[PDB]
Design a protein around this ligand. Structure first.
Ligand SMILES: CC(C)(C)c1ccc(-c2nc3c(NC(=O)[C@H](O)CO)cccc3c(=O)[nH]2)cc1
Ligand SMILES: [Zn+2]
Lengths: 47, 162
């Protein structure tokens, strides 16, 4: 486990090139997330 | 006996429906053409369960208050997706450093996505691993998959352009 950047609690990875992409995030303490919903699914073949 | 119970939600539940909506509406195409996580535009949602665990919840809210008070009373709390082969450990034991990616872009931490289809790429491991256990198919349309939709405290987030 690394440490957050000093004086920070996480890192936002901003989408830079991909126009349609949304952000990705990183935390360095597992206590900063709680798993609220467990989702069971299938990907669907396009028609 | 981990303390964790899973409450099954009904498809009629307002709470099932808004979670499903967030799952479906944040699907996107990926620059690998579907290589890690498969080729799809939408999901078949089969089940949504609430994860209830009093210890892990108190562990989360205790850290939230720490972060909040270090950031003008602003936890910066989001709902984000997490896909991992360890989802079953995570829901029973909670998140810790075994769920961090030591080799990640932004360091050895735990990664979450706003795009459900992005988390979908790590359901079977780094890069989609070898795909589903049964068919070894990263684009399996048969085998059931699981994602977590999680409550995340970001606090003061370091902005990284990329
Ligand atoms: C190493 C083990 C424990 C197998 C692992 C690795 C990655 C993920 C995982 N990674 C994500 C991610 N990761 C990256 O963008 C790059 O891997 C960083 O270099 C971005 C967005 C979302 C996720 C996400 O939901 N899960 C889960 C587990
Ligand atoms: Zn399969």
């Amino acid at each position: 486990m690394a440490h957050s950047p000093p004086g920070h609690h996480s890192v936002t990875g901003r989408p830079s090139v991909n126009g349609l992409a949304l952000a990705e995030y990183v935390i360095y303490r597992g206590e900063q997330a709680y798993p609220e919903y467990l989702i069971t699914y299938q990907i669907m073949r396009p028609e | 006996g981990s303390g964790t119970i899973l409450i099954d939600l009904s498809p009629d539940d307002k709470e099932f429906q808004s979670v499903e909506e967030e799952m479906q509406s944040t699907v996107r195409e990926h620059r690998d053409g579907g290589h890690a996580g498969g080729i799809f535009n939408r999901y078949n949602i089969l089940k949504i369960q609430k994860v209830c665990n009093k210890k892990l919840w108190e562990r989360y809210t205790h850290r939230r208050k720490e972060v909040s008070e270090e950031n003008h009373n602003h936890a910066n709390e989001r709902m984000l997706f997490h896909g991992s082969p360890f989802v079953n450990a995570i829901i029973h034991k909670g998140f810790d450093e075994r769920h961090a990616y030591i080799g990640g872009m932004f360091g050895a931490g735990i990664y979450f996505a706003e795009n459900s289809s992005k988390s979908n790429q790590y359901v079977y491991g780094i890069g989609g691993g070898t795909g589903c256990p049964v068919h070894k198919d990263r684009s399996c349309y048969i085998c059931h998959r699981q994602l977590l939709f999680c409550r995340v405290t970001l606090g003061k987030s370091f902005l990284q352009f990329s």
